[PDB]
Amino acid sequence: GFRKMAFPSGKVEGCMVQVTCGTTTLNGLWLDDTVYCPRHVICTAEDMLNPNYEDLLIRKSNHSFLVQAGNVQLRVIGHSMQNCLLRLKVDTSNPKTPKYKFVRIQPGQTFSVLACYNGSPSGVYQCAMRPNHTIKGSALNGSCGSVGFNIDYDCVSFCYMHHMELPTGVHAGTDLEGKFYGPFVDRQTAQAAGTDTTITLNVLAWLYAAVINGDRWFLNRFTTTLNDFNLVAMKYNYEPLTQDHVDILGPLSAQTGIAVLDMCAALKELLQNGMNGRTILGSTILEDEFTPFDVVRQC
Amino acid sequence: GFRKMAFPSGKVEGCMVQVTCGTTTLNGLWLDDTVYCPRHVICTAEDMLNPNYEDLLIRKSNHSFLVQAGNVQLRVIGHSMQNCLLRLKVDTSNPKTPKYKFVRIQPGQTFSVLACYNGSPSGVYQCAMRPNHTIKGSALNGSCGSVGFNIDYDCVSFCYMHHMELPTGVHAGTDLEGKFYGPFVDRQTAQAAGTDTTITLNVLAWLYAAVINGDRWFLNRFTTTLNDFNLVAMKYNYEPLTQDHVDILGPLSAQTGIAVLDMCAALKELLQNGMNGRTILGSTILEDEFTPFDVVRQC
């Protein structure tokens, strides 16, 4: 098979804290002398129906916030609001602060989430930002203040923070500047996600990972155009494949000697005929949570 | 629940080393002042056809083994063999040793694997020990010396270490006493693997997780005995369900208000009729890599 691996979580584990404001407690990211958490930590369940955050935050002081790093009480010496984030200045700088970056990822791109339970690391999983700008998972999977990240050598690129749980186990979130992904907001209203689609570029990359691991049964002599593939793509709830996408599949096409549009033809047949008791990389379904970058790296 | 979370890998990351003997390099486990790795590190390709481990090791000095933790080269001052493991005494105790136990797990049980390339933590995944005593994955997923573990409270329970990649593309390995799971040996030969049945207990645990998370379309009013359920289950390559398994699902049964045998009749119908394009916890297939303990822990 081909395991959907999360990044080793060690560097992010040392950064997780809990933040308590009144009766509300959630997770926060402790980097240097700042703690980052969702701004709705200052909101009770009642407050969430129509929250005036500037109105609610003026009533708070530095002592309104209880920050705890494991068994250690951190002392907050400043507070401010950056978009949908609460920024807390503390009197101690995190000695386990790794090399880090804040990045804004694109839909269809992947990252690891370290699910945390009131400051404490519980589990890690790999996921993709869905085309509808949501992250799938349970209440624990998307526990508020839990962060998404990529690790590139020694540097942690933080790209996501869990904020809201939408109906039927769907999560909405923010980057590390507090800007939401998608048309979502930090209040309890009716928020429907858009139409979720299969990440076509990702499926193709995973089919290339299949070939690299010796799985070849799905390939064919057939040839398709980009337009005729996208006619079959939309029919089965797949994302349109841009010319820019076929460029990104260059290195994987070269490594296997299989032309992108030939793999599209293979995908087309798979979409129309199914797998018929056969597996690809030990799977009965077409995986879409591996980017070309993930495949090249893990192959 | 929904997402198949691995444990936070932090405590295990600080234990990973690379061990080199001759032309072979693999992963090792550094705990206190001992380094654990597969004994076949002392073997070349030709050795692996018919390895005489006693003889191969007898003319190896302490200097024959190169061990490095990150960039620190560890001085090996002892060597011995524990079953299929090499035990290398080093001059320094691992300062990053966590509280740990070695345990042998049962087939169908779950653990996390920190996959490593030449001592460097690469990724982390959650898996189950198959009923045929194998672990599915790629070459990197099961790269020699990578360990499996659970984290219970503050304590790391190491249970598994990758040794061999089997012809089928699956992986064989030992516990941390060096005793293989299943009828496998550390020699490059033809090896009979049993049938990979579906872990029935785990599917039922997962169906309970679905109910708890408000996904209960698969439930019906039908009844069944353990005997009659197995006659259907044996036909779809599910392992027999025992009274012991029924008892294990007792707490989840009481929590959901759904009797085990009723959940069995729900499964029976799912096996016969299929899911019919519907999803359970966002999945189009039935998951068998969550234990009852995993379900309770994550819900």
CATH number of the domain to which B202 belongs:
1.10.1840.10
Q: What is the sign, positive or negative, of the torsion defined by CA atoms of B261, B267, B273, B276?
A: positive
Run of H or E residues at A230 = helix A226-235
Nearest to B123 by CA among B3, B250, B12: B12
> Who among A3, A169, A284 is closest to B125 (CB)?
A3
What technique determined this structure? X-ray
Phi-psi sector, B161: left (phi>0), alpha (psi -120 to 50), beta: beta
Which of these, B134, B132, B133, B141, lies nearest to B113 by C-alpha position? B141
Q: Which amino acid is at A134?
A: T
Q: What's the CA gap between B99 and A4, in Å, rounded?
A: 28
Which residues make Cβ contacts (< 8 Å) with residue A109, sequence separation at least 6?
A: A128, A129, A291
Assess whether B233 and B261 both reside in one domain: yes
By a Cβ cutoff of 8 Å, what residues of chain A touch chain B? 1-10, 13-14, 114-115, 121-125, 127, 136-141, 168-169, 213-214, 281-282, 284-285, 298-299
Kindly list the catalytic residues of B.
40, 144
Domain limit, last residue, from A63, A83, A98: A98
A18 and A166 housed in the same domain: no
A-B CB pairs within 8 A amount to 111
Q: Are A28 and A35 in contact (CB under 8 A)?
A: yes
Has A299 been annotated as catalytic?
Answer: no
Say if residue A122 is in the same domain as residue A63.
no
Q: Using alpha carbons, select from B22, B188, B177 the residue that is nearest to residue B85.
A: B177
A244: amino acid identity, one letter: D
Interface probe, candidates B138, B166, B287, chain A, greatest A C-beta count within 10 A: B138
End-to-end Cα separation, chain B, in angstroms:
6
Question: B53 to chain A, minimum CA–CA distance in Å?
Answer: 31
Whether B3 and B130 share a structural domain: yes
Residue where one domain finishes, among candidates B146, B174, B196:
B196
Q: Helix, strand or coil for residue B118?
A: coil
Using a CB-CB cut-off of 8 Å, the residues of chain A touching B298 are 123, 138, 140
Q: Which chain A residue has its CA at the smallest distance from B165's CA?
A: A1
Query: Which amino acid, A130?
Result: R
Token code pair at residue B159: 């249970």
Instruction: State the angle between helix axes of B200-212 and B260-273 in degrees (0 to 180), rounded to the nearest 10.
Output: 100
Give me the domain span that covers residue A39: 14-98
SS (H, E, C) B136-197: ECCCCCCCCCCEEEEEECCEEEEEEEEEEECCCCEEEEECCCCCECCCCCCCCCCCCCCCCC
How far apart are the C-alpha atoms of B280 and A73, rounded to whole Å?
A: 42
Distance separating alpha carbons of residues B275 and B290, to the nearest angstrom: 19
Question: Nearest C-alpha of chain A: how many angstroms from B243?
Answer: 31
Same domain? For B289 and B201 the reply is: yes
As for how many domains chain B has, the answer is 3
CB contact under 8 A, A298 and B123: yes
Asked if the Cβ–Cβ distance from A3 to B284 is below 8 Å, we say: no
Domain end position, chosen among A196, A212, A241 = A196
Find the length of chain B.
Answer: 299
From A286, which residue of chain B is nearest by alpha-carbon distance?
Answer: B284
Query: Is B91 in the same domain as B105?
Result: no
> For the stretch B138-151, what's the b/e string if a residue is b when 16 or more beta carbons lie within 10 angstroms of its beta carbon?
bebbbbbbbbbbbb
What is the rounded distance in angstroms from the CA atom of residue B52 to the CA atom of residue B187?
Answer: 10
Q: What is the resolution of this structure in A?
A: 2.3
**A40 neighbors A23 (Cβ within 8 angstroms):** no
Residue B134 contacts residue B182 (beta carbons within 8 Å)? yes
HSE of A282 in the Cβ direction (CA atoms, 13 Å)? 13
**Pair (A92, A171) in one structural domain:** no
C-alpha B82/C-alpha B179 separation (Å) is: 9
- Burial of B71 from C-beta contacts in 10 A (0-12 / 13-18 / 19+): exposed
Question: Which token pair is B147?
Answer: 């360990």
Dist CA B89 CA B97 (whole Å): 15
* φ/ψ of residue B298, rounded to 5: -90, -5
Maximum Cα–Cα distance across chain B: 69
- CB–CB contact B169 A115 (8 Å): no
Q: Number of H helices and number of E strands within chain A?
A: 8, 14
Residue with tokens 């599949």: A249
Q: Is A144 a catalytic residue?
A: yes
Q: Which burial class, exposed, middle or buried, applies to A296 when counting CB atoms under 10 A from its CB (0-12, 13-18, 19+)?
A: middle
Euclidean distance between CA atoms B205 and B281, whole angstroms: 13
- In this structure, the answer to whether residues B255 and B293 fall within a common structural domain is yes
Locate the chain B residue with the closest alpha carbon to A298. B140
CATH number of the domain residue A21 falls in: 2.40.10.10
Residues A74, A118, single domain; the answer is no
Tell me the nearest-neighbour CA distance from A255 into chain B, angstroms.
18
DSSP A180: B
Neighbours of A193 (CB within 10 A): 19
Pick left, alpha or beta for residue B268 (phi over 0 → left; psi -120 to 50 → alpha; otherwise beta): alpha
Please identify which of the residues A21, A37, A40, A171 carries the catalytic annotation.
A40
A contacts of B212 (beta carbons < 8 Å)? none
- Residues of B at the A interface (Cβ-Cβ below 8 Å)? 1-10, 13-14, 114-115, 121-125, 127, 136-138, 140-141, 169, 213-214, 281-282, 284-285, 298-299
For residues B7 and B38, membership in a common domain is answered with no
Q: Are residues B9 and B144 in the same domain?
A: yes
CA A93 to CA A30: how far, in whole Å? 8
The helix or strand, by DSSP H or E, that contains position A210, with its residue range, turns out to be: helix A200-212
B292 sits in which H/E element: helix B292-298
In angstroms, rounded to a whole number, what is the distance separating the alpha carbons of residues B119 and B243? 43
**Domain shared by A140 and A54, yes or no:** no
Q: Which residues contact B115 (CB under 8 A, 6 or more apart)?
A: A3, A5, B121, B122, B123, B124, B125, B140, B141, B142, B143, B146
Partners of residue B110 on adjacent β-strands = B128
> Would you mind telling me the total number of residues written for chain A in this entry?
299
Side-by-side strand order, sheet with B65-69: B72-74, B65-69, B16-21, B24-31, B34-38, B85-90, B76-82
